Each structure stands twice: as structure tokens, then as C-alpha cells.
Design an enzyme around this catalytic site. Structure first.
Site, short mmCIF file in Angstrom:
data_model
loop_
_atom_site.label_atom_id
_atom_site.label_comp_id
_atom_site.label_asym_id
_atom_site.label_seq_id
_atom_site.Cartn_x
_atom_site.Cartn_y
_atom_site.Cartn_z
CG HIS A 1 -2.11 -0.99 0.94
ND1 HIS A 1 -2.14 -2.23 1.56
CD2 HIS A 1 -3.20 -0.95 0.12
CE1 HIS A 1 -3.22 -2.89 1.15
NE2 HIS A 1 -3.90 -2.10 0.30
CG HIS B 1 -1.63 0.23 -4.42
ND1 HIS B 1 -2.23 -0.74 -5.18
CD2 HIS B 1 -2.60 0.81 -3.69
CE1 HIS B 1 -3.54 -0.76 -4.89
NE2 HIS B 1 -3.79 0.20 -4.01
CG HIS C 1 -6.75 4.46 -3.88
ND1 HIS C 1 -5.62 4.44 -4.63
CD2 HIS C 1 -6.89 3.22 -3.40
CE1 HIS C 1 -5.13 3.22 -4.63
NE2 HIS C 1 -5.88 2.47 -3.90
CG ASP C 2 -4.75 2.42 -0.62
OD1 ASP C 2 -5.73 2.35 0.15
OD2 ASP C 2 -4.47 1.56 -1.46
CG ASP D 1 -7.89 -0.72 -4.54
OD1 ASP D 1 -6.64 -0.43 -4.57
OD2 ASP D 1 -8.57 -0.80 -3.52
CD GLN E 1 -4.00 -14.73 -4.85
OE1 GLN E 1 -4.20 -14.18 -5.93
NE2 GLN E 1 -3.97 -14.03 -3.73
C1 LIG Z 1 -9.22 -14.39 0.02
N1 LIG Z 1 -7.88 -14.84 0.20
C2 LIG Z 1 -6.72 -14.33 -0.51
C3 LIG Z 1 -6.85 -13.16 -1.36
C4 LIG Z 1 -5.65 -12.35 -1.63
N2 LIG Z 1 -5.90 -11.06 -2.11
C5 LIG Z 1 -6.97 -10.32 -1.48
C6 LIG Z 1 -7.02 -8.82 -1.30
O1 LIG Z 1 -5.90 -8.04 -1.67
C7 LIG Z 1 -5.67 -8.05 -3.03
C8 LIG Z 1 -5.76 -6.78 -3.61
C9 LIG Z 1 -5.55 -6.72 -4.98
C10 LIG Z 1 -5.23 -7.87 -5.73
C11 LIG Z 1 -5.12 -9.13 -5.13
C12 LIG Z 1 -5.36 -9.23 -3.77
C13 LIG Z 1 -5.17 -10.61 -3.21
O2 LIG Z 1 -4.31 -11.34 -3.73
N3 LIG Z 1 -5.54 -14.98 -0.22
C14 LIG Z 1 -5.92 -16.01 0.70
C15 LIG Z 1 -5.12 -16.99 1.35
C16 LIG Z 1 -5.78 -17.84 2.25
C17 LIG Z 1 -7.19 -17.75 2.51
C18 LIG Z 1 -8.02 -16.80 1.91
C19 LIG Z 1 -7.39 -15.90 1.01
MG LIG Z 2 -7.34 1.12 0.30
ZN LIG Z 3 -5.57 0.53 -2.90
#
Ligand SMILES: Cn1c(CCN2CCOc3ccccc3C2=O)nc2ccccc21
Ligand SMILES: [Mg+2]
Ligand SMILES: [Zn+2]
Length: 313
Positions: free
Chosen positions: A68, A72, A106-107, A217, A269
């Protein structure tokens, strides 16, 4: 006035594409942002000197956290630039101004911790802003920077246009609270499918800009696989530190945040692609057909995570 930013040929060409990676040369990111404002908005949108002072104060108010961070900020602004460039006639002059700035800001002042963590920690910001805690903070930091001497990039707007652009920015930044994305997209799904979606209805434009904000985002999932995969390391470096801090408060973190559960990342994922990303780019593609490359790139990365689970990498 006659001073264009120009990029080297490979960047001049690739910056137009949704999957563009802004590269590891931090010193070129301000220039890339100005370039995008100039082509997206006009060379007349902002006084160059104010815009440069604004960008550099925004950069300074991003922290050296793994994900963040200032990279980003600029990455999310590039995705918005690509959406706006592929949808020339759908957006107003104020929208084009507001949304690149909203994305850069935004962040602002993010600490690498979720709203949930601030609330469990009992952070002063969780008392000041009970929902969308970090996002109300990011909007507050945006207004603070706009109010610094020589930083008012909107100074040529009328009182009511200024109020409209700050309102576009506020809603756009609040929309980046993923808690709000699910309901926003369900409403956009119903509106599109019953044919009631109306881009002259302001409350409808607000919803569609919110979805654009989620799309920009999340745009890490819309890059070429080697970018997506290496960005995931930065995303998880923050989540796992948050997980560690949950453990310090005597709270088992969710698995996504537990470094002891790295093995569950590939399945997590898939959940994320299937529950958030794919649905996000699908509804965006329905409303704004030229954003289809984002959905295609997202689906390609879903297929790459499926290959990781099958031990094909
Ligand atoms: C649900 N979730 C995710 C999601 C990861 N994630 C989620 C939020 O952040 C992001 C923001 C932008 C792009 C990608 C992501 C991302 O890779 N990884 C995990 C591992 C174990 C259990 C549940 C999980
Ligand atoms: Mg944010
Ligand atoms: Zn963001």
C-alpha cells in the site's frame, strides 16, 4: 503550456494497454502520472507547477510498506487512465480531473493494516471513522494536501465545480473499501440485467465509478502472470505482518493473514478470483465493453493459479 511530457517509445506504446507495469524506476512515476493526466484530461486541466508540487506531497504521504505504497497509487491511477482512454466520450471534464487524482490519493498514509486490524487494535482512527476507517482517512489526507499553499490543483474551478470534483474524489476513495464493493456490484448487476442502468442518473454514475475504483484497485490480478505473481508476494507480506500483529493482540488471524498457512494461498487466490475479481471485471465489462481486456487478463491469471494448485508450477 507548450511543455509535453513524452515517454520512451516502449512506455509510450505499452502505457495505453491495461496490463502496463509502471516499472522499478520510482523517479519516472511522477512523469508517467503527469503524462496520463495530460492525455486523459488535457495539458490545461492543472497548472504544471501546482500539479508537480501536489504529486510530490502525495508521494511523501505514502509510507514504505510492502504493497500500500506510492507504486500502488500510480499503478491504480494507470488502470483508471486506461479505462478513461478506452471510454473517451462516457465521462465529464470534472470526472476525468477527479478520478486520476482520486486514484493517486486513494491509499494516502496507509499503514499496511486493514480496517479490521485498526478496530481490534482500538486505533484512534477507528473512533474517528466507524466504517470505511482507512478510506475516510485517505480522503482526509487528500483534502489536507489540496489545502497546502501552492497545492490547490483545482483553484481555477468555480465554487460548485470544486464541490463536485471533491465529492467525486470522496465517493471514489470510499468505494475502494472492498466491504462496500459486494453490495455495489450486486446492485449494478440487477440494474444492468433489468435494463434500469441509466448513466444520466447521478446515483447510477456514482455506482459505476465505484466499480471502476474497485477494478483499478484490484488491477494487480489483471497484469501479465509474472507481475501478478510477484505483486502477490508484496500483498501477502502486509497480510502476514497484520497476522503477526493479530497474534500479538491474542487473536488467531484469518488464514489469508497467517504466515504459518502459506500452503493455503493458491486455494485462497481461487476464492478471491471467483468471489471478487472475475465478478468485478465481468460487471465492468457489461457496463463498459472496452474494459474487456481486464476480464480476459483476470481469467488468464485465474488459470495460472489453477496450474499452481495442479503442481504445474
Ligand atoms: C481471500 N484470500 C486471498 C486473497 C488475496 N488477495 C486479497 C485482497 O488483496 C488483493 C488486492 C488486490 C489484488 C489481489 C489481492 C489478493 O491477492 N488470499 C488467501 C489466502 C488464504 C485464505 C483466503 C485468502
Ligand atoms: Mg485502500
Ligand atoms: Zn488501494
Amino acid at each position: 503550456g507548450l511543455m509535453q511530457f513524452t515517454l520512451p517509445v516502449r512506455l509510450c506504446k505499452e502505457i495505453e494497454l491495461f496490463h502496463f507495469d509502471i516499472g522499478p524506476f520510482e523517479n519516472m512515476w511522477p512523469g508517467i502520472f503527469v503524462y496520463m493526466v495530460h492525455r486523459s484530461c488535457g495539458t490545461s486541466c492543472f497548472e504544471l507547477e501546482k500539479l508537480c508540487r501536489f504529486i510530490m506531497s502525495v508521494k511523501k504521504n505514502y509510507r514504505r510498506v510492502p504493497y500500500h505504497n506510492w507504486k500502488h497509487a500510480v499503478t491504480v491511477a494507470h488502470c483508471m487512465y486506461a479505462i478513461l482512454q478506452n471510454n473517451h466520450t462516457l465521462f465529464t471534464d470534472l470526472e476525468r480531473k477527479g478520478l486520476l487524482i482520486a486514484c493517486l490519493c486513494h491509499d494516502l498514509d496507509h499503514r499496511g493494516f486493514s480496517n479490521s486490524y485498526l478496530q481490534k487494535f482500538d486505533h484512534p482512527l477507528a473512533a474517528l471513522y466507524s466504517t470505511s476507517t482507512m478510506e475516510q482517512h485517505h480522503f482526509s489526507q487528500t483534502v489536507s494536501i489540496l489545502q497546502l499553499e501552492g497545492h490547490n490543483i483545482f483553484s481555477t474551478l468555480s465554487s460548485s465545480e470544486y464541490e463536485q470534483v471533491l465529492e467525486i474524489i470522496r465517493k471514489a476513495i470510499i468505494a475502494t473499501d472492498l466491504a462496500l464493493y459486494f453490495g455495489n456490484r450486486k446492485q449494478l448487476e440487477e440494474m444492468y440485467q433489468t435494463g434500469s442502468l441509466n448513466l444520466n442518473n447521478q446515483s447510477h454514475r456514482d455506482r459505476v465509478i465505484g466499480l471502476m475504483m474497485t477494478a483499478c484497485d484490484l488491477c494487480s490480478v489483471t497484469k501479465l502472470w509474472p507481475v501478478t505473481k510477484l505483486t502477490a508476494n508484496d500483498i501477502y507480506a502486509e497480510f502476514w505482518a497484520e497476522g503477526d500483529e493479530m497474534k500479538k493482540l491474542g487473536i488467531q488471524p484469518i488464514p489469508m493473514m497467517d504466515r504459518d498457512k502459506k500452503d493455503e494461498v493458491p486455494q485462497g487466490q481461487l476464492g478471491f478470483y471467483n468471489a471478487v475479481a472475475i465478478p468485478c471485471y465481468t460487471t465492468l465489462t457489461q457496463i463498459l465493453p472496452p474494459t474487456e481486456p481486464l476480464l480476459k487478463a483476470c481469467r488468464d491469471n485465474l488459470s495460472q493459479w489453477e496450474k499452481v494448485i495442479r503442481g504445474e508450477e
